[PDB]
Scaffold this active site. Structure first.
Site, PDB file in Angstrom:
ATOM      1  N   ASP A  62      -3.057   2.793   6.711  1.00  0.00           N
ATOM      2  CA  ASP A  62      -1.536   3.215   6.031  1.00  0.00           C
ATOM      3  C   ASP A  62      -1.677   2.918   4.582  1.00  0.00           C
ATOM      4  O   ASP A  62      -0.954   2.052   4.394  1.00  0.00           O
ATOM      5  CB  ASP A  62      -0.847   2.352   7.074  1.00  0.00           C
ATOM      6  CG  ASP A  62       0.618   2.838   6.626  1.00  0.00           C
ATOM      7  OD1 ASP A  62       0.788   3.419   5.562  1.00  0.00           O
ATOM      8  OD2 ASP A  62       1.666   2.285   7.300  1.00  0.00           O
ATOM      9  N   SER A  85       9.387  -1.847   2.388  1.00  0.00           N
ATOM     10  CA  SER A  85       7.559  -1.546   2.652  1.00  0.00           C
ATOM     11  C   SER A  85       6.803  -1.555   1.357  1.00  0.00           C
ATOM     12  O   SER A  85       7.407  -0.835   0.375  1.00  0.00           O
ATOM     13  CB  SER A  85       7.387  -0.657   3.626  1.00  0.00           C
ATOM     14  OG  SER A  85       7.283   0.732   3.114  1.00  0.00           O
ATOM     15  N   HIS A 108       3.866   5.911   5.058  1.00  0.00           N
ATOM     16  CA  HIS A 108       5.351   6.351   5.687  1.00  0.00           C
ATOM     17  C   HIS A 108       6.460   6.644   4.795  1.00  0.00           C
ATOM     18  O   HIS A 108       7.447   6.664   5.158  1.00  0.00           O
ATOM     19  CB  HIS A 108       5.503   5.277   6.850  1.00  0.00           C
ATOM     20  CG  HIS A 108       6.082   3.989   6.272  1.00  0.00           C
ATOM     21  ND1 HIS A 108       4.980   2.880   6.109  1.00  0.00           N
ATOM     22  CD2 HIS A 108       7.054   3.458   5.692  1.00  0.00           C
ATOM     23  CE1 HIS A 108       5.654   1.553   5.582  1.00  0.00           C
ATOM     24  NE2 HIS A 108       6.799   2.122   5.334  1.00  0.00           N
TER      25      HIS A 108
END
Lengths: 159, 159
Positions: free
Chosen positions: A58, A110, A36
């Site tokens: 991810d 993140s 992301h």
């Protein structure tokens, strides 16, 4: 304090128009970055590398070259209950769940790794959700068999 | 002092998505820009300028506007044997080769105008070769008749 013992030049940022957007880390001779986060890694040598996709977990994971493996993070599976050292600050692990104090962690945080007391990474943070005074955060860890278990809190908002 | 001539610097960084890939000089009332770099010149007046290509000599050249013709480097056709000044330290011109101390200059450190004790530019660097003893650089010098003689060391890499 324990922030000063969490220094590590291995972790690298991913910029987006000259701002912090993501964080890619080299662990066990392998470079990891989230789905992301969009942008280009600041390190040119890793930007030259071509990464493959893993939508479910991810994680873009890429194989570092021979010279890069000399200095990299170390990973283990065992996770004793209790407090762990993170770049922003202390985190605590109970009942099979990582969590952080309130407001600790936001957009662009993140991809940061989680460290233990003796200085080795055990998991990679992807996002978090505000349960309350303590913020449970989505994080990918490693099982004893080595299957990269991905624990994720319900309706977790992306970081 | 060799670096006491950074005040003489009138070069313009070229930024690509916030990343500087090289420097463009204004020598003798003429704008010189490395070809291999990408992006936009620091100032808008030169950014809007139209540049004519030169593939063999590997750079773009443009005619400076009349207003700041005087505000430029002054060139030189002769290069006496010996050591000159630079942003990154003293660099020696020996037997036609401009060589710097090893480990000086890397990717993105291109288009640097080389200077002498008189504060006049004599060459523009584009790339270099990491020869074991000392690093030689691909440069664009000037001769007495002014035909823009260009030198590239064998197996040269772009900067």
């Amino acid at each position: 304090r324990m922030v000063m013992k969490l220094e590590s030049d291995k972790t690298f940022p991913i910029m987006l128009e000259g701002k912090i957007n993501g964080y890619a880390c080299v662990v066990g001779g392998k470079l990891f970055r989230p789905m992301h986060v969009e942008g280009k890694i600041d390190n040119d040598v890793l930007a030259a590398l071509k990464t493959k996709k893993a939508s479910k977990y991810d994680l873009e994971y890429a194989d570092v070259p021979q010279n890069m493996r000399a200095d990299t993070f170390k990973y283990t599976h065992e996770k004793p209950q209790g407090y762990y050292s993170w770049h922003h600050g202390a985190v605590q692990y109970e009942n099979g769940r990582f969590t952080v104090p309130k407001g600790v962690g936001a957009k662009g945080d993140s991809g940061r790794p989680i460290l233990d007391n003796q200085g080795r990474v055990v998991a990679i943070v992807l996002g978090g959700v505000n349960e309350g005074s303590r913020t449970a955060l989505s994080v990918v860890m490693w099982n004893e068999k080595g299957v990269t278990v991905k624990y994720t809190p319900e309706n977790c908002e992306q970081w």
